[PDB]
Amino acid sequence: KMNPIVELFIKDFTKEVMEENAAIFAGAGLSMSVGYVSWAKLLEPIAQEIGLDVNKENDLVSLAQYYCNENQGNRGRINQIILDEFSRKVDLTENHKILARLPIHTYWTTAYDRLIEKALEEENKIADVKYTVKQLATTKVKRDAVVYKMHGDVEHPSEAVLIKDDYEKYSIKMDPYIKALSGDLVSKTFLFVGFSFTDPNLDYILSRVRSAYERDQRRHYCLIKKEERRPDELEADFEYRVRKQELFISDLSRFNIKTIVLNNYNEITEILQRIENNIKTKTVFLSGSAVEYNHWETEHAEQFIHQLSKELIRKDFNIVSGFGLGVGSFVINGVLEELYMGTIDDDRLILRPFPQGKKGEEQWDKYRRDMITRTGVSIFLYGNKIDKGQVVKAKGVQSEFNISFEQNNYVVPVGATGYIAKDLWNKVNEEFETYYPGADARMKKLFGELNNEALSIEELINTIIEFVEILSN
Amino acid sequence: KMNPIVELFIKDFTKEVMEENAAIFAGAGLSMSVGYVSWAKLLEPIAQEIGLDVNKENDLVSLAQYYCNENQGNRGRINQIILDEFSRKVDLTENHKILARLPIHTYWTTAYDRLIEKALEEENKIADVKYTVKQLATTKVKRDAVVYKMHGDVEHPSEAVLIKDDYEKYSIKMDPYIKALSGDLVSKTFLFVGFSFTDPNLDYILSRVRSAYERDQRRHYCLIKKEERRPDELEADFEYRVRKQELFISDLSRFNIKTIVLNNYNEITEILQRIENNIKTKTVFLSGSAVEYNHWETEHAEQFIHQLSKELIRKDFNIVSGFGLGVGSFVINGVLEELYMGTIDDDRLILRPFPQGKKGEEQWDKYRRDMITRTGVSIFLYGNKIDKGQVVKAKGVQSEFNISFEQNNYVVPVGATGYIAKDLWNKVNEEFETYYPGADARMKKLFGELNNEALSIEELINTIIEFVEILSN
Ligand SMILES: O=P1(O)OC[C@H]2O[C@@H](O[C@H]3[C@@H](O)[C@H](n4cnc5c4ncn4ccnc54)O[C@@H]3COP(=O)(O)O1)[C@H](O)[C@@H]2O
Ligand SMILES: O=P1(O)OC[C@H]2O[C@@H](O[C@H]3[C@@H](O)[C@H](n4cnc5c4ncn4ccnc54)O[C@@H]3COP(=O)(O)O1)[C@H](O)[C@@H]2O
């Protein structure tokens, strides 16, 4: 768990992303942990050429402009520097991979590198990268996300926004990008990551949006790390910097941009992981097959499964089922009862009955893996089939459990149902920290209660629902 | 004399002002020597309220914005502060008076005080002050200059541009002022005095003009004082500041704004005085009356006066004559010969014959004073009339000389012509430093040669012309 402000932000932004109305605004700071050297370090020889010192200079745009002025406006050196630095092959950080995995269809970047593009490519996602006005007129077919590199690309250094002339001519040359960013800011919920909010173009666009929409501006989010006490600095200077950052944060709200203050930069990764987990765990994989329903009678167990599926649908969960013999019909009935109040939404219930025959069993493993990949939580019930006239614990449920563990999915074996479910519950309880690291007391209590045969249908269903909810929320 | 760069700027800007195509852009720094306390000093309690320190802050606009943010956007305190400070009664500095005396019809000010307006009022000039969009639609009749207070007026503190919100909404609210300033920058030659070129609105306007006109931007001038070594600073920091200022100066050239580097702020007053002197001394008051032309014959002296007036007209001088008996006709003939090559331009020759009779002599003194006020250089020739049949040295020429001295006009008595002119030359040579303080060797030689009877017409005329030119140029 994190700070209550962080928890509220995680809930709200997960809600925004699940509606596919969220955009990510990534600054250069999101790529400073990857391995690219700092822009000030690159400009250090540039500053030394014109007799300045990059450490004593805070406005690097004016520094680059001065360098260009000293060379009759020529940018060849700076173009070569940025091409040499930001085109290097660097391993992607976890933040880029998580952002690629999230269902985010809009990225706006002020960085010249192609880390977002590579992260989207490695997720088998089609990325429509735009850094030219002409490129706005063409859309890639079946694209997953669109990346607006509003400061240019690394492979086109001459069109990168680096000097004051570029910023001064941006409003004329790149006006369609300004219009697109204004439309996204008024129509989408943005998350600013790695952005210092010192960019003149972004200040201009935000001021225009504020002038247009007054107090009815759309709420956006930013992630900013708190000020850290430098070794040379004194306590008074640190407190002054903290107060300055607080005043900076309120001016941002002047633009209806709420700032989340983070202790360190790994909290960005933690927040992204939490959002990804909240999105992924909303889909539950219901597994099991039952000819004999352990201690419970047939009708009682059927009603239990029906009401469990109805509660899962009611709690805004998407059920994926393999249509196991003896369990599939009743989860289908529960979903139908919950939804027919109507049509079957494709997202709420995904049914994947296994092909029957010799041909089907060849691809059964890949079918099972594809079915499980859609989910983030696996729920196992019973696990008994009939082979030679006798009830024998099934083997498909064990394979599903193995696949779920290999995919880092949460496993919720209900031991009260018995058979392979009870075996899996015993296995999980044998090594609880391996499957649920850092579990709370309530989580342990719910997991232990999952193997209670004295619970009624309602009590067991409520225990399962609460366990799945604390896993997801 | 000043630096050759300063001399070239003085010549070029005097040429621009004499064509009435010059405008003055005055910053707040032009009013910092008058007695108004610094804006940082005013914001010091404002900074202390929000927990900041105005000495550690450089962007006071952001400081005021932070204060407004801490008070729900209320500006009452800042409005009261600026109204209390900049509405005080302060004596005008010499710069404002000189600028008011110059034939400049366009002022653009970022200061809220009314020092330019008061300076124009004290010169009996009609000033059309504009700080509202509506005021642009009305023009004062017979106005001498128009003052655009583009950051608001002191008497309207709520509309002053002080905080970041004002700068962000300036491009929408005060767009007509932006258009007017762009038109003036492309149609008039500006002189920036007291301006630090750190104003976002001026940067935006200059960037737009540059984007519109590329390398064909009109040349403008700025006056900037060089960096001074602070007592606490080291030599390396001073050299770094000097280099930073040099880079700042070349960037302004990016906007075709040439910067004149001044050792101190009194050089602004010196430059303004030099421009005023160059404008004022271009009008010469030709005085004298002659019945007997000393040693020279009548025809010889008439030809001398004719050619002297022709040379004065040829050297771009405007002649004002009282039509004295024996001198007026021949200066008129010289002007006519120089101009009829055509019509008599009203500026080139102003003729003020004295009224004859008892009624005229009552107002003769005011007539003489008004006639002399139009000029900056007085040239005296002969000075002899006839009263009772005998040649007697005149008394009107002495009154003219007294009026010229009282108005601080340069006096050029030609002693070779004799009579009152010789008496005046002797009086000037008696106390030469009183009339020509800091005179060079060439000026003294020319003044001494002015009383040489051995010179021909051409030599004496050339001596007079060179003396008047070194007085003017
Ligand atoms: O019980 P298990 O070991 O694992 C159970 C899991 O598997 C999947 O459902 C089973 C099974 O109910 C279904 N099935 C239905 N009718 C027959 C049949 N399979 C073989 N038959 C021979 C004659 N009639 C049948 O075929 C799936 C594959 O077979 P297994 O994976 O071996 O089944 C679910 O997702 C369930 O979670
Ligand atoms: O010579 P001065 O002492 O000074 C000379 C200066 O004055 C002005 O011209 C004189 C003078 O030429 C003119 N004037 C012409 N004709 C007569 C006459 N004045 C009296 N008259 C009586 C009978 N007929 C005349 O009347 C101006 C006033 O008379 P004064 O100032 O006394 O003339 C110039 O600017 C000259 O520079």
B391 lines ligand 2 (CB under 6 A): no
Cβ contacts of A172 on chain B, cutoff 8 Å: 211
CA–centroid distance, A457 to ligand 1, in Å, is 25
CA–centroid distance, A325 to ligand 1, in Å, is 6
Q: How far apart are CA A290 and CA A397, in angstroms?
A: 11
Helices marked H in A87-145 — which ranges?
94-101, 115-122
CA–centroid distance, A343 to ligand 1, in Å, is 28
Catalytic residues of A: 151
Q: Is residue A273 within 8 Å of A101, Cβ to Cβ? A: no
Furthest C-alpha separation in chain A: 91
Contact (CB<8Å) B168/A207: yes
Residue among B382, B365, B364, B283 at smallest CA distance from B326: B382
Q: How far apart are CA B381 and CA A222, in angstroms?
A: 84
| Residue B263 burial (C-beta neighbours within 10 Å; 0-12, 13-18, 19+) | exposed
A→B contacts (Cβ < 8 Å), by residue, are: 50-53, 56, 62, 65-66, 69-70, 164-165, 168-169, 172, 207, 210-211, 240, 243-244, 247, 250-251, 254
B190: β partners: B23
Record the tokens describing residue B373, joined without a space.
């006020």
Which helix (H) or strand (E) is A69 found in, with range? helix A60-69
Q: How far apart are CA B332 and CA B355, in angstroms?
A: 18
Contact (CB<8Å) B244/A52: yes
| Residue B74 burial (C-beta neighbours within 10 Å; 0-12, 13-18, 19+) | exposed
Residues ≥6 apart with Cβ < 8 Å to B390: none
Q: Is residue A80 within 8 Å of A96, Cβ to Cβ? A: no
B325 lines ligand 2 (CB under 6 A): yes
| Expt. technique | cryo-EM
Record the tokens describing residue B225, joined without a space.
């004082």
SS3 labels along B53-108? CHHHCCCHHHHHHHHHHCCCCCCHHHHHHHHHHHCCCCCCCHHHHHHHHCCCCEEE
Q: Tell me, rounded to whole angstroms, the distance of Cα A399 from its chain centroid.
A: 28
Which helix (H) or strand (E) is A247 found in, with range? helix A235-253
Residue among A320, A364, A324, A265 at smallest CA distance from A34: A265
Looking from the CA of B348 toward its CB, the CA atoms found within 13 Å total 21
The DSSP bridge pattern shows strands A391-393 and A384-386 to be antiparallel
B418 lines ligand 2 (CB under 6 A): no
Record the tokens describing residue B186, joined without a space.
């492309």
Residues ≥6 apart with Cβ < 8 Å to A298: none
Furthest C-alpha separation in chain B: 91
The DSSP bridge pattern shows strands B106-109 and B22-26 to be parallel
B372 lines ligand 2 (CB under 6 A): no
Residues ≥6 apart with Cβ < 8 Å to A379: A284, A285, A286, A287, A412, A414, A464, A468
Record the tokens describing residue A41, joined without a space.
């370090």
Q: Is A96 annotated as ligand-binding? A: no
- Give the nearest ligand 1 atom to A395 CA: 3
Is residue A378 classed as helix, strand or coil in its secondary structure? strand
Contact (CB<8Å) B66/A250: yes
Cβ contacts of A74 on chain B, cutoff 8 Å: none
A127: β partners: A145
Q: How far apart are CA B189 and CA B349, in angstroms?
A: 28
Q: Tell me, rounded to whole angstroms, the distance of Cα A336 from its chain centroid.
A: 30
Long-range contact set of residues B75-79: C-beta below 8 Å, sequence gap at least 24: B75/B157, B75/B158, B75/B162, B75/B163, B77/B46, B78/B46, B78/B157, B78/B162, B78/B163, B79/B157, B79/B158, B79/B160
Q: Is B383 annotated as ligand-binding? A: no
Q: How far apart are CA A200 and CA A264, in angstroms?
A: 26
Beta strands in A346-409 (DSSP E): 349-351, 377-380, 384-386, 391-393
Enumerate residues lining ligand 1, CB below 6 A. A 287-289, 322, 324-325, 354, 385, 394-397, 400
* Residue A250: CB atoms within 10 Å: 14
B23: β partners: B106, B190
**What phi and psi values does residue B259 have, to the nearest 5 degrees?**
-105, 130
Q: How far apart are CA B179 and CA B73, in angstroms?
A: 29
| Residue B448 burial (C-beta neighbours within 10 Å; 0-12, 13-18, 19+) | middle
Residues in chain A: 473
Cβ contacts of A52 on chain B, cutoff 8 Å: 240, 243-244, 247
Q: Which of A69, A169, A243 sits opposite B51 (nearest CB)?
A: A243
Residues ≥6 apart with Cβ < 8 Å to B143: B126, B127, B128
Residue among B194, B193, B263 at smallest CA distance from B228: B263
Residues ≥6 apart with Cβ < 8 Å to A190: A22, A23, A24, A25, A108, A184, A220, A221, A257
Residue of B105, B151, B220, B306 marked active site? B151
Q: How far apart are CA A122 and CA A311, in angstroms?
A: 37
Q: How far apart are CA B101 and CA A413, in angstroms?
A: 95
Q: Which residue of B has its CA nearest to A247?
A: B66
CA–centroid distance, A193 to ligand 1, in Å, is 47
Q: How far apart are CA A404 and CA A398, in angstroms?
A: 10
Round to the nearest angstrom and report the end-to-end CA distance of chain B.
11
Q: Is residue B97 within 8 Å of B120, Cβ to Cβ? A: no
Sheet strands side by side (includes B220-225): B127-130, B145-149, B106-109, B22-26, B189-193, B220-225, B257-262
Angle of CA points B131, B134, B136, to nearest 5°: 70
DSSP state, residue A102: S
Sheet strands side by side (includes B283-287): B349-351, B318-321, B283-287, B377-380, B410-413
Q: Is A288 annotated as ligand-binding? A: yes
Residue pointed to by tokens 């002189």: B191
Q: How far apart are CA B426 and CA B420, in angstroms?
A: 10
Q: How far apart are CA A166 and CA A170, in angstroms?
A: 6
Q: Is B385 annotated as ligand-binding? A: yes
Cβ contacts of A207 on chain B, cutoff 8 Å: 168-169
Which of B327, B329, B332, B354 to probe ligand 2 with, by most ligand atoms within 8 A of CB? B354
Contact (CB<8Å) B240/A169: no
Which of B286, B319, B385, B387 to probe ligand 2 with, by most ligand atoms within 8 A of CB? B385
**What phi and psi values does residue B103 have, to the nearest 5 degrees?**
-75, 60
Record the tokens describing residue B43, joined without a space.
């914001």
Residues ≥6 apart with Cβ < 8 Å to B407: B372, B373
Q: Is B195 annotated as ligand-binding? A: no
Q: How far apart are CA A119 and CA A126, in angstroms?
A: 11
Residues ≥6 apart with Cβ < 8 Å to A86: A36, A111, A112, A113, A154
**What phi and psi values does residue B79 have, to the nearest 5 degrees?**
-60, -45
Q: Is A51 annotated as ligand-binding? A: no
Chain B interface test: which of A59, A65, A66, A255 (most B C-beta within 10 Å): A66
Record the tokens describing residue A423, joined without a space.
């075996």
**Alpha-carbon dihedral sign for residues A62, A65, A71, A74:** positive
The DSSP bridge pattern shows strands A257-262 and A220-225 to be parallel
Count H helices and E strands in chain A, helices first: 19, 14
Q: Is residue B136 within 8 Å of B176, Cβ to Cβ? A: yes
| Residue A91 burial (C-beta neighbours within 10 Å; 0-12, 13-18, 19+) | exposed
Q: Which of B168, B251, B253 sits opposite A211 (nearest CB)?
A: B168
Q: How far apart are CA B412 and CA B451, in angstroms?
A: 11
Q: Is residue A123 within 8 Å of A100, Cβ to Cβ? A: yes
Record the tokens describing residue A336, joined without a space.
């139908």
Looking from the CA of A220 toward its CB, the CA atoms found within 13 Å total 27
Is residue A108 classed as helix, strand or coil in its secondary structure? strand
**What phi and psi values does residue B120 have, to the nearest 5 degrees?**
-70, -35
Note the ligand closest to the C-alpha atom of A329.
1
B322 lines ligand 2 (CB under 6 A): yes
DSSP state, residue A36: P
* Residue B214: CB atoms within 10 Å: 7
Q: Is residue B236 within 8 Å of B28, Cβ to Cβ? A: no
Record the tokens describing residue A316, joined without a space.
């805004």
Which helix (H) or strand (E) is A78 found in, with range? helix A76-86
Q: Is residue A224 within 8 Å of A63, Cβ to Cβ? A: no
Between the alpha carbon of residue A456 and those of residues A419, A420, A450, A464, the distances in Å are 19, 21, 12, 12
* Residue B140: CB atoms within 10 Å: 13
Between the alpha carbon of residue A369 and those of residues A363, A414, A420, B429, B449, the distances in Å are 10, 21, 19, 114, 113
Record the tokens describing residue B155, joined without a space.
């008497």
Cβ contacts of A211 on chain B, cutoff 8 Å: 168-169, 172
Residue pointed to by tokens 């404008």: B279
Residue among B224, B247, B56, B261 at smallest CA distance from A53: B247
Q: How far apart are CA B468 and CA B443, in angstroms?
A: 10
CA–centroid distance, B324 to ligand 2, in Å, is 6
Sheet strands side by side (includes A106-109): A127-130, A145-149, A106-109, A22-26, A189-193, A220-225, A257-262
Is residue A52 classed as helix, strand or coil in its secondary structure? coil
Record the tokens describing residue B23, joined without a space.
């405008």
**What phi and psi values does residue B33 have, to the nearest 5 degrees?**
-90, 0
Q: Is residue A43 within 8 Å of A64, Cβ to Cβ? A: yes
Q: How far apart are CA A426 and CA A393, in angstroms?
A: 15
Record the tokens describing residue B157, joined without a space.
């503190």
CA–centroid distance, A419 to ligand 1, in Å, is 15
Residues ≥6 apart with Cβ < 8 Å to A400: A285, A287, A322, A368, A372, A378, A380
DSSP state, residue A351: E
Residue pointed to by tokens 């990551």: A193
Q: Is A385 annotated as ligand-binding? A: yes
Contact (CB<8Å) A251/B69: yes
**Alpha-carbon dihedral sign for residues B452, B453, B456, B457:** positive
B353 lines ligand 2 (CB under 6 A): no
Residue among A331, A411, A342, A423 at smallest CA distance from A382: A423
CA dihedral (A88, A94, A100, A102) in degrees, to 10, reads -170
B→A contacts (Cβ < 8 Å), by residue, are: 50-53, 56, 62, 65-66, 69-70, 164-165, 168-169, 172, 207, 210-211, 240, 243-244, 247, 250-251, 253-254
Q: How far apart are CA B413 and CA B401, in angstroms?
A: 9
Record the tokens describing residue B425, joined without a space.
């030359």
Which helix (H) or strand (E) is A260 found in, with range? strand A257-262
SS3 labels along chain B? CCCHHHHHHHHHHHHHHHCCCEEEEECHHHHCCCCCCCHHHHHHHHHHHCCCCHHHCCCHHHHHHHHHHCCCCCCHHHHHHHHHHHCCCCCCCHHHHHHHHCCCCEEEECCCCCHHHHHHHHCCCCEEEECCCHHHHCCCCCCCEEEEECCCCCCCHHHCCCCHHHHHHHHHHCHHHHHHHHHHHHHCEEEEECCCCCCHHHHHHHHHHHHHHHHHCCCEEEEEECCCCCCCCCHHHHHHHHHHHHHHHHHHHCCCEEEEEECCCHHHHHHHHHHHHHHHCCEEEEECCCCCCCCCCHHHHHHHHHHHHHHHHHCCCEEEECCCCCCHHHHHHHHHHHHCCCCCCCCCEEECCCCCCHHHHHHHHHHHHHHHHCCCEEEECCCEEECCCCEEECCHHHHHHHHHHHCCCEEEECHHHCCHHHHHHHHHHHCHHHHCCCCCHHHHHHHHHCCCCCCCHHHHHHHHHHHHHHHHC
**What phi and psi values does residue A87 have, to the nearest 5 degrees?**
-95, 5
Record the tokens describing residue B253, joined without a space.
């050239």
Residues in chain B: 473
Angstroms from B204 CA to nearest CA on chain A: 8
Residue pointed to by tokens 């402009």: A65
Angstroms from A112 CA to nearest CA on chain B: 25
Q: How far apart are CA B450 and CA B428, in angstroms?
A: 12
Q: How far apart are CA A189 and CA B266, in angstroms?
A: 56
Record the tokens describing residue A214, joined without a space.
């007054």
| Residue A285 burial (C-beta neighbours within 10 Å; 0-12, 13-18, 19+) | buried
DSSP state, residue A231: S
Residue pointed to by tokens 């006709």: B329
Angle of CA points A45, A50, A51, to nearest 5°: 90
Q: Which of A53, A66, A207 sits opposite B247 (nearest CB)?
A: A66
